Amino acid sequence: GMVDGWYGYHHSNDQGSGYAADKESTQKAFDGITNKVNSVIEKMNTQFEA
Amino acid sequence: NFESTGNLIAPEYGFKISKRGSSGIMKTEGTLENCETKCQTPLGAINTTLPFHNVHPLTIGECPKYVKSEKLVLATGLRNVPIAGFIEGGWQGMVDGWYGYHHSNDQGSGYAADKESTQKAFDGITNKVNSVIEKMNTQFEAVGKEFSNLERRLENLNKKMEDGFLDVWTYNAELLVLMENERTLDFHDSNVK
Amino acid sequence: VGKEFSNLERRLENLNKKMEDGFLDVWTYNAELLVLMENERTLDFHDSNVK
Amino acid sequence: QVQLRESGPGLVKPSQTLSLTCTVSGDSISNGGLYWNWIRQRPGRGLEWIGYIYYNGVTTYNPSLRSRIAISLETAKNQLSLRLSSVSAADTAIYYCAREGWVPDYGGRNYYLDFWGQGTLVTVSS
Amino acid sequence: QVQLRESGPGLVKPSQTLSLTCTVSGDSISNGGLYWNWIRQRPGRGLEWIGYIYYNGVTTYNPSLRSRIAISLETAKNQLSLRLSSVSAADTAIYYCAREGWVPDYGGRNYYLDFWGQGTLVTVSS
Amino acid sequence: DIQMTQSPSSLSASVGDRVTITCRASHNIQNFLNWYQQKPGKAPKLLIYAASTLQSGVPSRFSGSGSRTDFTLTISSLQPEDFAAYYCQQSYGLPRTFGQGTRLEIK
Amino acid sequence: DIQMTQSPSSLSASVGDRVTITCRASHNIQNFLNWYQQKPGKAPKLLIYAASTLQSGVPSRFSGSGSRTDFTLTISSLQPEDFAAYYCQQSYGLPRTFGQGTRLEIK
Amino acid sequence: DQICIGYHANNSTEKVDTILERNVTVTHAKDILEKTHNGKLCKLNGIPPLELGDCSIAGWLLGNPECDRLLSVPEWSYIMEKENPRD
Ligand SMILES: *[C@@H]1O[C@H](CO)[C@@H](O)[C@H](O)[C@H]1NC(C)=O
Ligand SMILES: *[C@@H]1O[C@H](CO)[C@@H](O)[C@H](O)[C@H]1NC(C)=O
């Protein structure tokens, strides 16, 4: 069901159910993942070289 | 045996090697000062106790490893998050350990460290630091070499080799510090839990 | 692996030796570090699985 | 954050001593471990490096001024100073102080001047 | 923990065979994968290496004794032995057994002798 | 000590043009070249350090590269604001030196 | 095979003095030099292995270093107890050899 | 009353980086990188360097007329030579 995040809630109730992302958790994890990718790729150092 | 029919510039003196220990040739335009050191770089002397330095690739002495980095710092401690437990952050009062208890009661409250937990974690952290730093192996070495102008291929090979190892070790040093700091902080949060 | 150098090739012999010692240090380091990192995770893995 | 400010007499007579002071603000002169530099521009001419002092008293100079120049610092006030003896017309210039920072590199620390002061003009005349 | 003990006849006549036995204790002779050595000191003279045996039967010798020496071990008793034929006055010496350990190194295993026995004196006389 | 030769002595280019200024060292200065921009009335501003790295705040139109003894400053998309003398600085040794300064005029 | 030359043949030094003893190999023995201390009536004790590493239990006053063909034993702060012959051992090849032994007397 | 489990907090401003997080304040850290030097050329292990200054190695060993102060050849801890020496 979800596309607005990674982690989230179903929220069933008497008005009606519907999934929603947990924005606090996804955003912290999201920045964790993007920082991780950058730490992995920014450590590679290349240069023009014959 | 020397023999010449002309054009000979003969030595008058020879140079006996009287002492053969390691040294090296340093290129610098400074002069000797009235000071002492156990490790010297072209930019000045270093008094060190840590495994890495960022002053210069060349050095003469018993020196730390050189890395191409501004900062290598190992967390040893807790994330410093400034009546509430670990969920909220650290009780400010405790100086007798890392993890501990508040102990509120009817005789009176007062924070105390959990000595069993802190000591096990403490030894874990000191062993960790030692595993990180004791794996660096350096030696007295006259690192710099000179090449003639007809040896560009070799000079470039030598330079590439040295730059290559510097990148490998800088990478390993930075990566190890980052991987360990992530685990150190998880370790501490895990131990409180 | 072994190479021989003449007595007028000290700069090259030293380059070769440094290269070989350098790679040995890198691989010894990687082998020991990997074993220690993995043993830490292996033991955590097993304690995690029992939990 | 880091600023460098300069002052001095403005006018120096021939054969007198030129003396300028640079005040460092936002950067502890004794803690950064950086080198502090003096540079000048004579009218018409380009930048000429004068000399520098480390955070401690180690000091180096442009050899052309070796018979005339002294550089020193007072850690207590975050100040640098330049002193030139036997000053003549050739010493008229805009004087500048600057901070020397660095990049760790394959050849050792790679130095550059990021923070410069506004500088000041010293006129040498009768 | 590791000790080496030695025994032998004490007195050997010229042209007889000299035979010494070293007993290894606290170190399994067949499991360590170490080399076991014989060394001796003639009066006045310094240390002379005699030879060694691996934990298995591979054996090497000092070439000067190639016509006279044999070394062997018995795994069952943790014992080493030295045999020298055609013994003469020059063979009077304190004999020692020792264990050869090692350091992995850049040039291959770097060998050294850590544990030595007390040794024993063999006199050659008429 | 190590002397620096800077060339052209002056440039003239239109807005939108790309120009180059070069540095030639008398010796090998191993990636220790810095470039500075001096506008009239101001202390020189650092543009490029360690041959090719831009200083924070420096517009992306500025770039450069080089190796032992030879370096180039490239300024693309010149704007009316890019009026300055440009200088070559050699940080390799202790008696630090500068080139003559290239004067770039914008049309 | 590879012969070892040890020098001085004897030393005399006072308590508190620092002395050196050296090893010279006829060939390149690549960091495979061991040093031994022989007190009268005893089997030699290992002090230094692999040129510069101390054996466990060896006092910190002992040190040494070296490279191909040339090594030094340094004994600082000599005590009355440091009376011994010191020997050079070359572990590089199979027919292992020793130097002559340096006799150090303490005053 | 309640017993709380917590951890230490401090007034430390020391910060570290991790793979997925940056600029994290910690109570303690070990700086393992040496960032200073004294700017001086010193006597290594108490023994001074050979100071050639303006002299090159060939100048010294051949005896350049202007390197007449190097003829005494004292013990060296290292050799100090200017880049691009004159003599
Ligand atoms: C290094 O620093 C310590 C103080 O931490 C000092 O006692 C020692 O003398 C210094 N070493 C040198 C060679 O100056
Ligand atoms: C780290 O955080 C402090 C505030 O606690 C901030 O002033 C500093 O600029 C930050 N550092 C970086 C590199 O963002």
Please provide the DSSP assignment of G50-89 as one string. TTTEEPTT--TTEEEEEETTEEEEEE-S--TT--EEEEEE
Number of Cβ pairs < 8 A linking chain B and chain H: 240
Contacts of residue G46, Cβ cutoff 8 Å, sequence gap at least 6: E112, E113, E114, G34, G35, G36, G37, G55, G58
Q: Touching check for E106 and chain C: CB below 8 Å?
A: yes
**Apex CA B74: angle with CA B69 and CA B76, to 5°?**
170
Q: Alpha-carbon distance C36 to B50, whole Å?
A: 22
Chains adjacent to E (≥3 CB pairs closer than 8 angstroms) = C, G
Q: Of C11, C22, C33, which is closest to B165 when you measure between CB atoms?
A: C22
Question: What does the alpha-carbon distance between residue G30 and residue G73 come to, in Å, rounded to a whole number?
Answer: 16
Nearest alpha carbon to residue B22 among G88, G50, H45: H45
Give SS3 for C40. Answer: helix
Where do we find the tokens 């704007």? F79
Instruction: Note whether E96 contacts G43, CB cutoff 8 Å.
Output: yes
Taking each helix axis from N to C end, the angle separating B152-192 and C10-50, rounded to the nearest 10 degrees, works out to: 20
User: Are the beta carbons of D58 and H38 separated by less than 8 Å?
Assistant: yes
- Whether residues D116 and F99 touch (CB distance < 8 A) is answered with no
Kindly give the pairing relationship between strand F102-106 and strand F10-13: parallel
Query: Is any ligand 1 atom within 6 A of the Cβ of residue B49?
Result: no
Whether the CB of G64 is below 8 Å from some CB of chain E: the reply is no
**Inter-residue contact E77 to E10 (CB < 8 Å):** no
* Interface H:E, ≥3 CB–CB pairs < 8 Å: no
Contact yes or no for H85/B32 (Cβ under 8 A): no
Backbone angles phi, psi at B40, to 5 degrees: -125, 130
List the end-to-end C-alpha distance of chain A, in Å, as a whole number: 52
Looking at chain B, which runs of residues are DSSP E strands?
25-27, 32-37, 39-41, 44-45, 52-53, 60-61, 65-66, 73-75, 99-101, 112-113
Q: Which two tokens stand for residue B154?
A: 């070799």
The C-alpha atoms of residue G3 and residue G12 are separated, in whole angstroms, by 26
* DSSP conformational letter for C13: H
DSSP secondary structure letter of residue E106: T
Burial classification of residue G35, based on how many CB atoms lie within 10 Å of its CB (0-12 exposed, 13-18 middle, 19 or more buried): buried
CA distance E82 to E51: 9
Tokens 């596309």 sit on residue: A3
Alpha helix locations (H) across H1-87? 57-62
Beta-carbon contacts of D80 under 8 Å, excluding residues fewer than 6 positions away, are: D21, D22, D24, D29, D36, D38, D53, D71, D72, D73, D97
Distance CA E15, CA G51 (A): 41
Of E48, E98, E107, the CB nearest to G32: E107
Backbone angles phi, psi at C26, to 5 degrees: -65, -45
Q: Is B36 in the pocket of ligand 1 (CB under 6 A)?
A: yes
Q: Minimal Cα–Cα distance from F58 to chain B, Å?
A: 22
The answer to whether D79 touches D24, Cβ cutoff 8 Å, is yes
Pocket test of ligand 1: the residue of B39, B47, B49, B50 to mutate, having most ligand atoms within 8 Å of its CB, is: B47
> Which ligand 1 atom sits closest to the C-alpha of B47?
1
**What are the chain D neighbours of H38 within 8 Å (beta carbons)?**
56, 58
Q: How far apart are CA D59 and CA D38, in angstroms?
A: 11
Q: Which ligand is nearest to the CA of B40?
A: 1
The distance between the two most distant Cα atoms of chain D, rounded to a whole number of Å, is 51
The DSSP letter of residue C20 is H
Three-class SS state of D63: helix
Task: Read off φ and ψ for residue D90, nearest 5 degrees.
Answer: -65, -15
Question: Helix, strand or coil for residue D20?
Answer: strand
Angle between helix axes B115-133 and B152-192 (nearest 10 degrees) is 170
H-type alpha helices, E74-114: none
Closest CB to C25 among B137, B147, B157? B137
Going from the Cα of D81 to the center of ligand 1, the distance in angstroms, rounded, reads 30
- DSSP, collapsed to helix, strand or coil, labels residue D75 as helix
Q: Is B135 on the interface with C (CB under 8 A)?
A: yes
For atom 11 of ligand 1, the residue with the nearest CA is B47
Q: How far apart are CA D103 and CA D114, in angstroms?
A: 12
* CB burial readout F38-66, b (16+ within 10 A) else e: beeeebbbbbbbbbbbbbeebeeebebeb
Question: Which residue's CA is the nearest one to ligand 1's atom 6?
Answer: B47
Q: What is the resolution of this structure in A?
A: 3.1
User: Are the C-beta atoms of residues F63 and F77 closer than 8 Å to each other?
Assistant: no
CA-to-CA distance for B16 and B21, rounded, in angstroms?
A: 14
Q: Residue G90's closest CA among G50, G56, G37? A: G50
Please work out whether the CB of residue B1 comes within 6 Å of at least one atom of ligand 1. no
Among D58, D60, D109, the residue with its CB nearest the CB of B56 is: D109
